[PDB]
Each structure stands twice: as C-alpha cells, then as structure tokens.
C-alpha cells in the first residue's frame with residue numbers, strides 16, 4: 172500500500188486505478204496476422220545476428236505489458252542486483268521493496284515521477300547548473316526550486332545542510348510544514364558540468380535525506396560512462412530507507428532512438444508510475460524491447476559490460492582530444508574541470524559577463540557553434556560566462572578549429 | 586499563438602516552453618557509432634523489403650524531432666488532406682491552422698490532450714458506455730463527467746441539446762462560468778458498443794459545439810475499420826471553426842506494438858502537446874517511425890487503401906461469423922446490434938441484472954470468457970446486464986463453443 176509514501180504522492184496520482192483450455196472473447200487485442208511486416212533480421216557489430224521469425228514478429232508487432240516484457244524486466248533486475256545490491260530487495264512492498272519498470276526512454280519515467288510528486292508551491296532541491304530539460308519539466312509544475320551549491324565534486328553537503336536548517340527535522344511528517352519533497356541530482360557526469368559526486372558526499376547527502384526525510388531522485392544516464400574504471404557506489408546501493416528512485420538510460424550505450432530506459436525504486440511509487448503509463452503510452456515499443464532483450468540475453472552481463480568498456484574507451488579518447496585542444500588554445504583565457512563522466516566540457520570564459528552575444532552573433536558567423544550556459548539555470552535570463560562543449564562526435568581537426576575561433580573571440584571581446 | 590485557445594488550456598500547459606556553422610559542439614547527441622545494431626532487413630508481405638543500410642541504421646538508433654520524422658509527417662499530412670480535406674489547412678496558426686503530431690500510440694496524444702485541458706471541477710461531455718481506458722484516464726483529473734445518451738447510431742443530438750440547455754451560450758467565453766470544455770467521442774465502432782455516428786448527427790453535434798463553443802475530441806481508432814465501404818465524413822472534415830482535435834491510430838491496421846499513432850488539430854493546441862512530449866517521451870521510436878515511413882511511401886496512398894481494404898474484408902468476415910454464432914445460440918436470450926465498425930459485439934443478456942457472477946465464476950469453469958459491461962461506465966460498481974465480445978481473433982469454431990456455453994449459463998438463471 173501507499174500509506175509510507177502518501178505524503179509524497181499527489182491527490183491525482185493516488186486516485187489512479189489499474190487500467191491494463193480457455194476460449195476468451197474478452198480481450199481487446201487486434202489480430203496480428205493483419206500486420207504487414209513479417210520477419211526481421213538485425214545485424215550486431217561482431218555479434219550474433221538477431222532474427223525475428225514469423226511468430227516472434229507477431230509478438231513484436233503486438234501490445235505487451237505496461238511495465239515491460241518479462242524477459243527484459245528479469246534481465247534488468249538481475250543487472251541492478253549484481254551492480255547495486257539494493258538493501259530493499261528484501262523488504263515488504265509497503266516498506267519500499269525494490270521494483271523496476273521499463274519506460275519509453277528514461278525521461279518518461281522521470282517526468283511521471285515529477286508529475287506524481289509535485290503540487291504547486293511544493294519545495295524541491297537541486298544543484299544548478301542543471302540539465303535544461305529537467306528545468307523545463309519542473310517549471311510548469313509550479314514548485315519552488317531551491318538551489319543547492321555545487322563544485323567539481325557535485326553537491327556540497329554543507330550547502331544542503333545549511334538550506335535544510337530552515338526546517339526542523341520533525342516538520343517532515345507534519346502535513347502543515349512545506350518541507351522538501353525531494354532532492355534531484357545527476358550524480359555521474361552532470362549535464363552540463365561534467366562533474367560527479369564522490370562516495371563520501373553521497374553518504375553524507377543520504378544522511379541528510381534521512382534526517383529531513385525526503386526522497387532522492389537519482390537521474391543517472393551516464394552511470395555507464397564513468398572514466399574512472401571503479402564505478403562510484405550509487406544512492407540505490409545505500410538505500411536502507413527505500414527513499415531512492417533511480418532513472419537509468421540505454422540512450423548513450425545501446426540506442427537513444429529506440430526509446431528504452433528504466434526506472435527502479437520503491438514498489439508503491441513504481442506502481443503509481445505504471446498506472447500513469449497504462450493511460451498514456453501503454454508500454455514501450457514491444458519490437459524494440461525484443462531487439463534489446465535478445466542482444467542482452469546473448470551478451471550476458473559479461474558481454475554487456477565489455478561493450479560498456481568499449482564505449483567508455485571511445486569517450487575517454489574524445490575527452491582527451493577536447494582537453495588537449497583546450498590546453499592548446501584556451502589556457503589563460505578560460506577555466507574548466509576535467510569531466511569525470513559523460514560527453515560534455517563546461518567552460519567558464521574569463522573576463523566576459525555574458526557569452527550568449529559572443530556565440531549566437533559572432534561564433535556562428537565564423538562557422539562554429541558552441542552552447543551558452545544560460546539554459547542550464549532556473550533564471551535563464553541572468554548573464555552567463557559558461558559554455559557547454561560536446562565531445563561525443565567532433566574530430567581532433569574540428570576541435571582544433573573550434574577552439575582557435577573561441578580563443579580569437581574571447582580576446583576580441585576583451 | 587495561444588490567446589484564442591487559452592480558455593481551454595490549463596495554467597501548467599500554457600507555462601511550458603520549447604525544450605528540444607559547419608562545426609557544432611553545441612549538440613547533445615551521443616555518438617551513434619557506438620550502438621551495436623548495424624543493419625536491418627524487414628520483409629513486407631508481397632511488398633518491397635525494408636532495408637536499413639549502415640547510415641540509415643545510425644539514423645534509426647538516434648534521437649529525432651519531437652513531432653516525428655519530417656517524411657512521416659508530410660506523408661500523414663497529405664493523407665489527412667486526401668481523406669478529410671479540412672477547412673483549416675488554409676488558416677493562420679492563431680486561428681487553428683491544421684497541424685500534426687506523431688505520438689507513441691494514439692493514447693499518448695489523447696492523454697496529453699486531457700491533461701492540457703482539464704482543471705479539477707471542469708465539465709466534460711461523453712456518451713456511456715465508453716472505453717474503460719478513457720474513463721480511468723479522466724477519473725484522476727477530477728472533472729465532472731456528464732453522460733450524454735447514445736443509441737445504435739451513437740450520440741443522440743436531442744440529449745446533447747437538453748444537457749447543454751443548462752448553460753447559456755454567451756457564458757462560454759466568460760472565464761468565471763464553468764461551461765463544458767469538450768465533447769469526447771469515438772464516432773466509428775465505439776468500444777464497447779460497436780455503434781457509429783451518422784453524418785447527419787455529426788452535422789447536428791458540430792452545430793451544438795459551435796453554439797456552446799466547446800471542443801470536439803474525435804478519438805477515431807476504428808476509422809479504417811468501417812464495414813460500410815463508404816466512410817462517414819469526420820468531424821475534422823467539417824471543422825470550419827478549428828475546434829476539433831483528432832486522434833488516429835495505426836494500432837489496428839499496421840501494428841499496435843510499435844507504438845505509433847498521430848494527432849491532428851489546431852496548431853496552438855498541437856504545439857502544447859509537443860512541448861509536453863519534449864519533456865517526457867521526447868519523440869516516438871525513430872526506428873519504428875522509419876519502418877512505417879518506408880512502408881507507406883512505397884505503398885503510396887493506393888497501396889495503403891488496398892491494405893486497408895483487405896483488413897476490413899478480414900474483420901468483416903469475423904463480424905459475420907460472430908453474428909451467426911449469436912443467432913444460433915442466443916436468439917431470445919440476448920439483444921445486440923450489428924457492429925458498424927471495430928472489433929466488438931456488445932450483448933445485453935435478457936432477464937438478468939448483473940452478469941459479473943455469471944461470467945467471472947460460472948463461465949470461467951466451463952472455459953469461456955466475455956468482458957462484463959461494468960468497466961465501461963463512470964460508476965462501475967453499478968450492476969450491468971452487458972457483455973463485450975471480441976471477434977478479432979476467434980475462429981468460427983471457437984465462437985460456436987463460447988455462445989453455446991453462454992446460452993447454457995443464461996438458462997441456469999432465467
């Protein structure tokens with residue numbers, strides 16, 4: 172039941188109801204034999220070709236369960252246990268028993284989670300600069316976003332401690348005190364900053380979240396792109412309270428265009444999210460789930476982790492290329508921290524108040540496109556000296572050209 | 586864009602903002618080279634094979650525009666023009682210029698439309714019995730659902746006229762008065778009833794929508810499954826005012842499991858749906874959209890309509906089969922109408938109050954299920970004499986078996 176999670180949940184979310192030998196005339200499935208696609212053959216780099224014969228193609232073209240197809244869900248649960256060993260797998264449902272939901276990309280799960288929790292006027296916690304997409308999702312919900320200080324190691328727990336001191340810990344379960352519903356964070360390779368939390372910080376933030384009793388929403392699309400070969404423990408692995416909701420993405424690792432992600436957290440909150448899925452998308456593409464599931468079952472955890480290693484090596488090499496181009500052209504004209512994960516470099520330009528002018532007007536003129544930092548803040552009209560540079564795609568030639576131009580422009584703009 | 590649809594739009598919906606030079610480092614795309622699927626071949630029955638070579642696979646696995654791929658959108662826009670010729674294609678944006686959105690199933694779009702529109706306390710109109718999935722969607726949004734009488738030709742205009750008589754026409758644009766936001770209907774082959782609106786009723790209803798200035802939400806997943814070979818004009822075809830939002834579905838025709846449908850309507854409302862999508866699913870599967878696009882462009886409008894004709898002929902034979910089975914076993918035991926479209930027969934059992942015990946314990950034993958009517962009403966705890974029978978899949982033999990058992994169980998309680 173919802174009873175320990177009710178203070179977190181909206182009146183509308185709580186109001187949702189399920190909306191999913193034997194000759195049955197009771198179902199509402201169309202006839203699959205009418206669908207025009209018949210068989211599929213899918214090629215896999217140095218891998219086993221995936222084949223959908225006639226009967227698997229009928230499955231793939233047909234409706235399937237809201238939470239995901241059972242083979243994928245089971246594979247992903249075992250993955251989570253192997254990687255995070257969450258203490259909640261062993262608890263009753265009311266106490267936050269770990270559960271998982273395949274979603275249509277990890278943004279879908281996150282959005283349904285924000286929609287589940289937020290009433291207008293609710294207080295929520297995040298560190299700016301934050302992903303512009305999360306900001307635009309929170310804005311129409313009408314909550315006050317309360318900014319927590321961050322630095323090259325993510326959220327500074329001293330700043331969080333100081334923000335929360337405006338309440339008493341005893342206020343949390345008092346329905347008349349507007350204590351924070353949650354803290355939102357991207358712990359690995361934050362977009363735009365590139366910075367990651369340390370485990371020391373995570374342990375410290377987790378104790379605060381216990382002390383003031385709010386949820387941690389751990390949005391982690393670069394979990395599998397950490398450049399340090401030992402991965403940092405997640406909030407999920409330390410979640411003794413069942414207060415963590417985790418969003419994982421295949422968008423950087425397997426495919427972004429396939430729209431397959433997954434949400435993991437306390438069963439009663441996952442159930443709310445699934446009930447919302449049941450009246451919207453109904454489920455993620457059955458076809459794309461079968462493609463991924465067949466790949467992952469043939470790979471095993473081991474083949475999966477080898478591919479992740481391969482992808483990390485590529486991004487590591489790209490990261491070294493962009494840092495060298497920056498060392499070359501931008502030293503003394505700008506500041507940046509080495510990215511700990513992900514695909515972005517966050518550059519603070521010296522001696523210029525707002526950089527938006529410099530990029531939109533002048534850089535474009537020169538055939539170079541960087542992104543200004545403005546859209547990563549709650550007040551995006553405030554001036555910004557930062558720009559986000561992507562290193563996922565550019566060649567070393569193109570990075571060299573891009574930074575000469577940026578160097579030229581920094582200097583000309585004084 | 587908004588001011589004259591603002592009256593229909595929630596506060597949250599209107600607050601949403603957009604959330605989507607030879608060298609660009611400004612982009613947020615992962616490298617598609619890292620994704621493990623390299624090429625794909627999908628066969629089409631008596632059609633040309635769909636091939637994703639190396640470069641088209643990279644595109645299929647990558648993010649794409651929130652409203653859909655440009656080639657699917659243009660092909661669908663030309664389809665709507667051919668089938669419906671909406672008055673609205675020539676209007677400026679603000680006055681409701683026709684626009685289209687590809688969605689992850691037609692239900693995603695419907696859900697985003699209800700959410701975009703409804704504030705707690707709002708009045709909405711519809712006819713019961715209605716789709717249980719629609720009812721579960723509306724329930725948590727807190728609106729007053731006002732039932733409109735329907736019969737075997739669908740919504741009865743005189744009932745609509747009488748209900749609306751409780752409001753003044755000139756209160757519609759009074760912000761302080763709570764006139765109906767919209768009429769929701771499924772005008773071909775309503776699930777569960779199988780009945781369809783006639784064009785005369787459509788004209789009448791449209792004129793009422795104009796008089797009381799509400800929107801029509803035309804949810805039309807069986808439009809391509811009409812058993813009269815000449816299709817009824819749609820609300821979209823007569824939409825001089827730009828007050829019609831139309832949801833189309835490929836689910837019954839091409840594939841339910843690919844999660845591709847689309848929404849047509851006034852650009853300012855479609856714009857609101859898109860902005861919601863940009864912070865949730867982001868877009869529908871690029872892979873699935875490209876498979877469908879290749880299919881449709883190769884077929885052209887003619888191959889598409891020939892395919893549709895074959896699906897109608899198939900379902901039309903199932904309809905005949907289930908009707909014969911009904912005549913054989915149920916004459917003088919039940920009442921039903923012949924379905925005008927869709928895949929359901931709706932049966933009233935005579936001389937019984939609630940079928941729920943009759944089916945969900947007594948008939949399950951003999952190995953037969955049909956859906957009790959309760960879930961198709963706003964108050965599902967009320968007793969129902971009705972059963973919904975699907976004819977999409979069962980063979981004529983299994984139909985005989987189910988109606989034999991049904992006939993028997995009714996005898997055992999007459």
Ligand SMILES: *Cc1c(COP(=O)(O)O)cnc(C)c1O
Pocket residue numbers: 275276277278279302357362390392419420421422427430431432867
């Ligand atoms: C890349 C990324 C994602 C992934 O989006 P999906 O919906 O999983 O495709 C989510 N959040 C951030 C901040 C990202 O950078």
Ligand SMILES: *Cc1c(COP(=O)(O)O)cnc(C)c1O
Pocket residue numbers: 453689690691692693716771776804806833834835836841845846
């Ligand atoms: C079958 C059906 C649909 C189809 O939904 P998709 O999201 O397009 O699969 C929608 N509404 C009703 C009433 C239906 O019966």
